[PDB]
Design a protein around this ligand. Structure first.
Ligand SMILES: COc1cc(C[C@H]2C(=O)OC[C@@H]2Cc2ccc(OC)c(OC)c2)ccc1O
Ligand SMILES: COc1cc(C[C@H]2C(=O)OC[C@@H]2Cc2ccc(OC)c(OC)c2)ccc1O
Ligand SMILES: [Mg+2]
Ligand SMILES: [Mg+2]
Ligand SMILES: [Zn+2]
Ligand SMILES: [Zn+2]
Lengths: 326, 325
């Protein structure tokens, strides 16, 4: 119960950017997704709101967590827990106070939890180019993301796993649609289109008399949730450096293992996946400059000035990686 | 009785092929015999080095994955859509538009476009929480499944009709086939029609009247609308054919409505056998869907679709006359 006390203390940071998610994974016995989701559901009163039995929540979360691969270095249950917790912090931003309903909040957190389930540790392009069964099933289109949704939803049908058993039919239908719309938007090939649309929304943004974002139709509401989860998914370089560097080590391992499979198959090796011709530091600076900072600066504009500290951390971490190059 | 079948197959280039007769005379293999005939007529076996035995083995296996107990979405419909696409690809206004790989993709897409169809709609599959809708996240559920089956069957023994295509050819063909079949999702009708109207408004032609389509986006949109028109071509056929298609779709609709009734769900439009108006539904279908679509097609290929449009308007007038005052 001493370990349990230490875990509880660490979970006190669940509302903070920079939670010690790797320490939570160890202290929880490799159940970071289960314990962070349960803590967040308690913090947001979601079990009471949606009449979710606690044993059903825990059973589902444990089964979902089991369907992340413990043998992939990056796209595992720790990444899922991190994206869940990051989405939870973004949802609490002052610019969004009272903007989303409880069902939308539930959808965004559930989408984050399932968004990479059963990820094999290789990209959509690799699955397409190797004629995989997954790419055959999904017609080369959002292959991974369609699979993560189908698994996340199928698991609700296992014994004592239907956490949505007490929602109305209309609530379940709406939640299902929003979860699909959010996870499909995490397909990395959609990033540019998603950001272009977010930029349009910032350029045209409306704020209520209370100072919060005005979102008066489904398209705008879902677009904000899609970009929120995509920011959470691309949040590693915005975290304190000791967390960011562990994420870099993990993604590089997954990339290099994919590159080794590509090399052995005589395929051209994907960018950043050739361990014999890699520049990890240049690759992080490029990732920040071309992808992560454009996205996060736009998100920070949407919610100005709420995300200023996050953006400042991203910029400091860019400067740090750059300083290692010369 | 291969002589009568060969005679019937001599009409493979004509709108109004006796496809039901062919289905009967071929021992319920219209898809195989019509695909084979078209591949010969277009010299596709030589062009793509397709071994004839592989072609037949694949076609028979694909045909077997259409359900024999579904009245409309079966192998006869697949064969009809194939042959209708084959005729549309020969529209004079489209001469020189499409490459041989694009022709191959449109015909293969038509052949597979409804394979393994269970005889119920996407909305039925979604609202019944079916395994198919769970797999495909409620999005083009049937059409994703038809593509996955159609491609998976190429992996059966002696079924890889594309074995001698180059690697780039196979990649391009696969993408085009996916783009075409997913566009056959009926819920996309208005979007496709909009694309088609835009292409008509901005159409570039030679001084002969031949369409010039420079970019892939425009050409795939033409092929999407072409296969969609073929899919929605029953009311533009000779009336004796059209009336058989109406009988078949109504049987399939009513069976869906019977399953819906027994499961106590709301019965979909046209699916309630105790409350149906078959003839009014056909006139409505032509007025709101098939005629707008085919008139826009006819504008795109003006004036080469005028006989097809003529037949459609004749058949509309006939069905209207069957509705009493
Ligand atoms: C959307 O843009 C990109 C997407 C991708 C593929 C993504 C994926 O599939 O899993 C994660 C990958 C994003 C990523 C996360 C953490 C990183 O470092 C900690 C990192 O380093 C390069 C890259 C690569 C490069 C891109 O530019
Ligand atoms: C795109 O618009 C619609 C689509 C649909 C659903 C389609 C489908 O899934 O299978 C075939 C159906 C089209 C169809 C074909 C032949 C017909 O009669 C010979 C017919 O009669 C009503 C309707 C129904 C109504 C529509 O208006
Ligand atoms: Mg993902
Ligand atoms: Mg279809
Ligand atoms: Zn992810
Ligand atoms: Zn069809």
């Amino acid at each position: 119960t001493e370990q349990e006390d230490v875990l509880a203390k660490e979970l006190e940071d669940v509302n903070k950017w920079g939670l010690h998610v790797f320490r939570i994974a160890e202290l929880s016995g490799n159940r970071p997704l289960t314990v962070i989701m349960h803590t967040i559901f308690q913090e947001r009163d979601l079990l009471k709101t949606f009449k979710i039995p606690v044993d059903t929540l825990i059973t589902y979360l444990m089964t979902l967590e089991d369907h992340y691969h413990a043998d992939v270095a990056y796209h595992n249950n720790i990444h899922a827990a991190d994206v869940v917790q990051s989405t939870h912090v973004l949802l609490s931003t002052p610019a969004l106070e009272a903007v989303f309903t409880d069902l939308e909040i539930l959808a965004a957190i559930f989408a984050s939890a399932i968004h990479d389930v059963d990820h094999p540790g290789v990209s959509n392009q690799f699955l397409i180019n190797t004629n995989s069964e997954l790419a055959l099933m999904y017609n080369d289109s959002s292959v991974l993301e369609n699979h993560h949704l189908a698994v996340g939803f199928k698991l609700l049908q296992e014994e004592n796993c239907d956490i949505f058993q007490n929602l109305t039919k209309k609530q379940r239908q709406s939640l299902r649609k929003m979860v699909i719309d959010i996870v499909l938007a995490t397909d990395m090939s959609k990033h540019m289109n998603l950001l272009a649309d977010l930029k349009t929304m910032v350029e045209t943004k409306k704020v209520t008399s209370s100072g919060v974002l005005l979102l008066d139709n489904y398209s705008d509401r879902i677009q904000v949730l899609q970009n929120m989860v995509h920011c959470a998914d691309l949040s590693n370089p915005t975290k304190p450096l000791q967390l960011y560097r562990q994420w870099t080590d993990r993604i590089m391992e997954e990339f290099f293992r994919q590159g080794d499979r590509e090399r052995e198959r005589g395929m051209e090796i994907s960018p950043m996946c050739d361990k014999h011709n890699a520049s990890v530091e240049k690759s992080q600076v490029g990732f920040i400059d071309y992808i992560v900072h454009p996205l996060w600066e736009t998100w920070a504009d949407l919610v100005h000035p709420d995300a200023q500290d996050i953006l400042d951390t991203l910029e400091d971490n860019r400067e740090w990686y750059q300083s290692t190059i010369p």
